[PDB]
Amino acid sequence: VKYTPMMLNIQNMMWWNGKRNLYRATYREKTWYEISRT
RNA sequence: AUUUUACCAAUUAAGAAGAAUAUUAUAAUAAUGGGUGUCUUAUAUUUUAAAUAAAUAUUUAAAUUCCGUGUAGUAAAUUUAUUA
Ligand SMILES: [Mg+2]
Ligand SMILES: [Mg+2]
Ligand SMILES: [Mg+2]
């Protein structure tokens, strides 16, 4: 793998096109917005 | 002795279950992919990886900048909760 789909800004979302990115967590206990609430 | 010229005018009540567990938003309590006219045994029915996502964010300041694509806990399991 030399170029990951996250480079090309490809929108892969389940509710959008039924696809999800290969390198991600299946479950996320806290989303990015909760982590940023310092 | 039979014998009426040619042309020229218009849509109005509808009758009868021949109208509904009807359409569209609305339920913060369910959820292993629904397939009935189905039905033997699976070497043959395996999808996972720290990122923005079926999880979606109460402001007008300053500042990176050949000329601002922007605002932070409100309560620490606290009642904004994806419901049928
Ligand atoms: Mg006349
Ligand atoms: Mg009728
Ligand atoms: Mg539930």
Gap from A1 CA to B75 C1', in Å?
Answer: 47
Q: What resolution, expressed in A, was reported for this entry?
A: 3.1
CA A25/CA A6 separation, integer angstroms: 14
A15-22 own/partner pairs: CB under 8 Å, 24+ apart: none
User: How far: A35 CA to B16 C1' (Å)?
Assistant: 70
CA A38 to C1' B6, whole Å: 104
| Rounded-to-integer distance, Cα A28 and Cα A35, Å | 11
Quote the tokens at residue A20: 């999800």
The approach used to solve this structure was: cryo-EM
Per the structure block, which two tokens stand in for A11? 């929108």
Distance CA A37, CA A31 (A): 10
Please count the other Cβ atoms lying within 10 Å of the Cβ belonging to residue A5. 14
**Contact (CB, 8 A) for A38 and A22:** no
3-state secondary structure of A17: helix
Residue A19 makes CB contacts below 8 A (sequence gap 6+) with A12, A13
The Å distance, Cα A35 to ligand 3 centre, comes to 26
Ligand 1 centroid to residue A16 C-alpha, Å: 75
